[PDB]
Amino acid sequence: QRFPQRYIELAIVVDHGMYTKYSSNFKKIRKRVHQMVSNINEMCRPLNIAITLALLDVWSEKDFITVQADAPTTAGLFGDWRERVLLKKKNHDHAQLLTDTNFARNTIGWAYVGRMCDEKYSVAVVKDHSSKVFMVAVTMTHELGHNLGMEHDDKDKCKCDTCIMSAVISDKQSKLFSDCSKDYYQTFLTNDNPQCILNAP
Numbered sequence: 001q002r003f004p005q006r007y008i009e010l011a012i013v014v015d016h017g018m019y020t021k022y023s024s025n026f027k028k029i030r031k032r033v034h035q036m037v038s039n040i041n042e043m044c045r046p047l048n049i050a051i052t053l054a055l056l057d058v059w060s061e062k063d064f065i066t067v068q069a070d071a072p073t074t075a076g077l078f079g080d081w082r083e084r085v086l087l088k089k090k091n092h093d094h095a096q097l098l099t100d101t102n103f104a105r106n107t108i109g110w111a112y113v114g115r116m117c118d119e120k121y122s123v124a125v126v127k128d129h130s131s132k133v134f135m136v137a138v139t140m141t142h143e144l145g146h147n148l149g150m151e152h153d154d155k156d157k158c159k160c161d162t163c164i165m166s167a168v169i170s171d172k173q174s175k176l177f178s179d180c181s182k183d184y185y186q187t188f189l190t191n192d193n194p195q196c197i198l199n200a201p
Contacts, residue, residue, distance in 0.1 A: 001048045002182065003189070006197045008044075008116075008144070009054035010037065011086055011095040013078075015067050016059045018128050021100045029058055032133060033098075039137035040144065043164060043175050047185055052201055054092040071103045071110035071125050079112075079120040087119060093196045094122040094147060096140055103127055108169065111143035113151070117194035122147060138164060138173050145181060149188030153180045 012033050022029050033056055041051040064085070065077040078097045086095055094116060103110075108127040115121030124143030128136055145165050152167040153160060160178035162170060177185075 002046075003048040003185065006047075006049045006189075007200050008049055008051050008094055008197055009092045009201055010040075010051060011055040011057065011082070011090070011092040012037070012053060013082075013086065013095060013097045014056070014058045015097060015099045015101075016061070016063045017067065017100040018098055019058055019060050021128065024060065026058055026060065030056060035133045036137040036140060039134055039175075040141050043138070043141045043177070044144075046177060047182070049197070050200070054201070055086070055090045057086065057089070067097070067099050067101050067125075069101070069104040071107045074099075074101070074103075075110050075112070075123060075125045078125055079123045082123050083119045093117055094124070094144065096124045096126055096143065098126050098128050098136075098140075100128050109139045109143045111146045113146050114149040114188060114192060116147045116149075116188075116192075117196035122196075134175075135169065135173065138175070139169065142169075145177065145184075148185055149192065150181045150184040153178045157183070 037053045065081050082095045108129045111124035112121040126140050142164050153165045158178045158180035162172045162174045163176050163178035165181045
């Protein structure tokens with residue numbers, strides 16, 4: 001393996017709009033979330049990161065934060081709620097909020113760069129932007145990548161045009177991380193090396 005073993009214990013939060021979108025059916029929602037995690041796990045295999053679902057929280061009554069059009073604003077509110085509430089329910093390394101919100105500018109996700117393990121900033125928000133599980137899981141993996149110190153792919157740095165960290169998604173989306181992404185991950189493990197992902201469950 002190019003990379004040493006790491007582990008990411010994920011918490012996935014499904015908001016009320018997404019709960020409603022999926023017929024208020026918890027079983028259906030749980031199944032979709034599991035299929036997403038199985039795809040994130042597959043996409044992270046070349047990085048040697050074992051992905052697990054530590055916690056699933058479905059907002060079946062109401063939203064606990066204001067899930068609004070600006071994704072970064074939503075992410076900040078989600079990070080606050082994740083630190084103050086979600087982390088007290090069960091410890092985990094990174095949390096993603098899934099929503100059906102029509103984020104502004106056709107945005108489909110957002111996350112803080114390089115803040116994996118941080119109590120407030122190890123989060124992402126992701127739009128359930130396709131009926132195709134794989135396409136939403138790629139976006140979850142893309143935001144996770146940013147949180148692991150990755151920036152978007154750049155043609156001068158690596159040749160992959162449709163990899164996970166492409167600036168924009170497309171139908172020919174590949175399940176692979178580019179060499180740009182792998183190099184950013186190496187830099188993150190060398191310069192940051194957060195402790196929580198060294199811990200196996």
